[PDB]
Each structure stands twice: as structure tokens, then as C-alpha cells.
Amino acid sequence: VVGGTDADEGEWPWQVSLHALGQGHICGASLISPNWLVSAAHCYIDDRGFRYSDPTQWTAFLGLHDQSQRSAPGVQERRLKRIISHPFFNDFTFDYDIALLELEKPAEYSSMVRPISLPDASHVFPAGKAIWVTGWGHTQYGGTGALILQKGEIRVINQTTCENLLPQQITPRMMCVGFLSGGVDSCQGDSGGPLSSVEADGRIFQAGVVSWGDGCAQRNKPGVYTRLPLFRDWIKENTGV
Numbered sequence: 001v002v003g004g005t006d007a008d009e010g011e012w013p014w015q016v017s018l019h020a021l022g023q024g025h026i027c028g029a030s031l032i033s034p035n036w037l038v039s040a041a042h043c044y045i046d047d048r049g050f051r052y053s054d055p056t057q058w059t060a061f062l063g064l065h066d067q068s069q070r071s072a073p074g075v076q077e078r079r080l081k082r083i084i085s086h087p088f089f090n091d092f093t094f095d096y097d098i099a100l101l102e103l104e105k106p107a108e109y110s111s112m113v114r115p116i117s118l119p120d121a122s123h124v125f126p127a128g129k130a131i132w133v134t135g136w137g138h139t140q141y142g143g144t145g146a147l148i149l150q151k152g153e154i155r156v157i158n159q160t161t162c163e164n165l166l167p168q169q170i171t172p173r174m175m176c177v178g179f180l181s182g183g184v185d186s187c188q189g190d191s192g193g194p195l196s197s198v199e200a201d202g203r204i205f206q207a208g209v210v211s212w213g214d215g216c217a218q219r220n221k222p223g224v225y226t227r228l229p230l231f232r233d234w235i236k237e238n239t240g241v
């Protein structure tokens with residue numbers, strides 16, 4: 001997250017850190033039940049040097065605040081039993097960029113570990129709405145990741161505007177969120193983590209999933225996120241959640 005600030009400890013207890021064997025933190029995820037996480041499909045695509053699609057080559061850290069303190073009170077470490085990537089995911093366009101991660105053993109909810117509510121299929125997060133992104137990604141483009149979980153408040157962008165800012169790249173599965181003036185944005189390493197919509201009365205919903213962007217925090221280049229309401233039935237079908 002570029003242009004954000006340190007989260008309070010336990011402030012985003014649904015935020016998860018996913019480490020690939022021998023590489024440290026690669027992507028985020030969100031806790032949605034004791035056994036399941038939501039993340040981005042593109043994080044789990046093999047490359048020539050490493051099988052990111054192999055669930056056994058991941059470790060999930062639940063209840064984490066500081067990447068240098070992974071044995072701190074509150075942290076629950078888990079392996080993945082499986083990675084369900086969306087059937088329509090396209091690694092060229094990043095359409096349908098969403099995956100479901102099954103933990104090998106369930107999380108136990110605590111002050112540091114708690115699920116985020118899913119939005120139902122009819123839920124709308126209208127253009128203009130201020131919502132939050134969190135993660136341990138780069139805090140500057142080309143920079144390095146954050147040790148301490150970062151948070152940044154960003155706004156949903158109109159879809160026609162989004163399409164035009166990133167021409168021939170936006171599908172209905174995607175949403176731009178950020179500022180047209182840049183400054184605050186997700187960045188490398190935030191992928192797969194949640195957009196958290198915090199309402200005045202304490203209702204909190206996951207609005208989307210960090211997916212991709214053109215640079216980070218540039219003007220007229222807001223981050224692109226996977227919309228979550230459209231996937232409510234797919235999540236129910238595949239996980240029971």
C-alpha cells in the first residue's frame with residue numbers, strides 16, 4: 001500500500017499473509033470462515049522457477065501484524081489443503097481474478113483472527129464510496145514491502161471512467177478503486193487481500209479483492225480490484241460459506 005499508514009494491531013483481523021516456500025510474503029488473502037480464505041487467482045499461477053499453483057508450497061499467517069514477528073501472540077500459522085481458482089480466470093487479462101483457499105485445519109477466532117462478512121449478490125458499492133485496502137505490499141512503486149500491515153482509504157471509481165483510464169483492459173468483473181489524483185493505492189504484494197467497506201454502524205463487508213494496476217499511486221491510474229458480490233454463489237457452491 002502506497003500512501004497509507006500503519007494499521008493498529010488487530011484492526012483488520014480478517015487480513016491474511018500468504019508466503020510461498022522460501023520466498024516470504026507474496027500475496028494477501030481474507031478470512032471468510034474458519035476453513036476458507038478468499039484471495040486472487042493470479043497469485044497461484046506457476047512460473048518457470050516455482051509452482052505457485054501447488055497448495056503445499058504455501059503458508060498462511062492469520063492474526064499477523066509484523067512480518068518480522070510471525071511467532072507473536074495471536075498468530076495462527078496454517079498450510080493450504082487446496083486452491084480453487086475461478087474456472088474463468090484468464091492469466092492474460094486477469095479477468096475473474098479470484099481464488100478460494102482451504103486451510104488444512106480451522107482457525108480459531110480471537111481478537112486478532114476474525115472473518116469478514118461477504119456481500120450478497122445484490123450488494124452495491126457505488127462510485128464515490130470510501131473503502132479500505134490493507135496489505136504488506138510495496139509502499140512505493142519499485143520499492144520494498146512493509147513489515148507492518150498498512151491501511152489506506154480509497155474511493156470506488158465509476159466503471160465507464162475506469163474502462164477509459166485503462167482502455168481495453170476492464171471487464172465487468174473488475175472495479176477501479178483509488179483516487180483519480182493518485183497518492184493512495186495498492187501495490188505489489190497487496191494482491192489477493194481484501195477491500196474492506198466499513199459502514200458507520202459497524203457493518204463491515206468485503207467489497208473486492210486486490211488484483212492489478214498500472215504502476216502504483218499514479219494519477220489517473222487507480223488500482224483494479226475483483227468485484228465480490230458477483231461471486232457470492234460461486235463461493236457458496238465451492239466452500240459452503
Ligand SMILES: *O=[P@]([O])([C]C1=[C][C]=C(C([N])=[N])[C]=[C]1)OC1=[C][C]=[C][C]=[C]1
Binds near residue numbers: 187
Ligand atoms: O496483486 P499483486 O501484488 C500486483 C499488483 C500491483 C499493483 C497494484 C496496484 N493497485 N497498483 C495491485 C496489484 O501481485 C504480486 C505480483 C508480484 C509479486 C507479488 C505479488
